[PDB]
UniProtKB/Swiss-Prot annotation:
Disulphide bridges, residue numbers: C26-C84, C40-C95, C58-C110, C65-C72
Location of the active site: H12 (proton acceptor), H119 (proton donor)
UniProt note on tissues of expression: Pancreas.
Keyword Disulfide bond: yes
Protein name: Ribonuclease pancreatic
Subcellular location: Secreted
EC class of the enzyme, as a word: lyase
Organism: Bos taurus (Bovine)
C-alpha cells in the first residue's frame, strides 16, 4: 500500500512546470497519475512548486482542517496550482476534466516524522 506522504505526492505534486499550459492538462495528468483507474476522481489539485516548498507548508500557518482536526497548515505565500474537476457530463472510463490554473494559498494536512503533507485540504 502507498504511504500517505507518497500518495499526496502522486496526487498533488507537479513541480515539472510552472503552470498548466493547456486545457488538456488535467485530462493528461489525471490519467498519468493513475487517478482515473476504476472511477474518475472528481476533484484534484496539482501544485506547481517544488516538493520542498510544499513540504515547508507543514511549518507555516496552523489552521483547522475542514474536518475540524488541527494538523492543517496554510501556506504563507500563494502557489501556482491547477485545479482539475470532472465536467458534469464526464463518464468513466472516458473521464473528462476542466483545467483551472490559479495562484492561491494551499492548505495541507501534515503528519508523521518527518512531518509532511498527507492531504490536500483546500486552496484559497
Ligand atoms: Cl503512511
Ligand atoms: Cl500509481
Ligand atoms: Cl484536491
Amino acid at each position: 500500500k502507498e504511504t500517505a506522504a507518497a500518495k499526496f505526492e502522486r496526487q498533488h505534486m507537479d513541480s515539472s512546470t510552472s503552470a498548466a499550459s493547456s486545457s488538456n492538462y488535467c485530462n493528461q495528468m489525471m490519467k498519468s497519475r493513475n487517478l482515473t483507474k476504476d472511477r474518475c476522481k472528481p476533484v484534484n489539485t496539482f501544485v506547481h512548486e517544488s516538493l520542498a516548498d510544499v513540504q515547508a507548508v507543514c511549518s507555516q500557518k496552523n489552521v483547522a482542517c475542514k474536518n475540524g482536526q488541527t494538523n492543517c497548515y496554510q501556506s504563507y505565500s500563494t502557489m501556482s496550482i491547477t485545479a482539475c474537476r470532472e465536467t458534469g457530463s464526464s463518464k468513466y472510463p472516458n473521464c473528462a476534466y476542466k483545467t483551472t490554473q490559479a495562484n492561491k494559498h494551499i492548505i495541507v494536512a501534515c503528519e508523521g516524522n518527518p512531518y509532511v503533507p498527507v492531504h490536500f485540504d483546500a486552496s484559497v
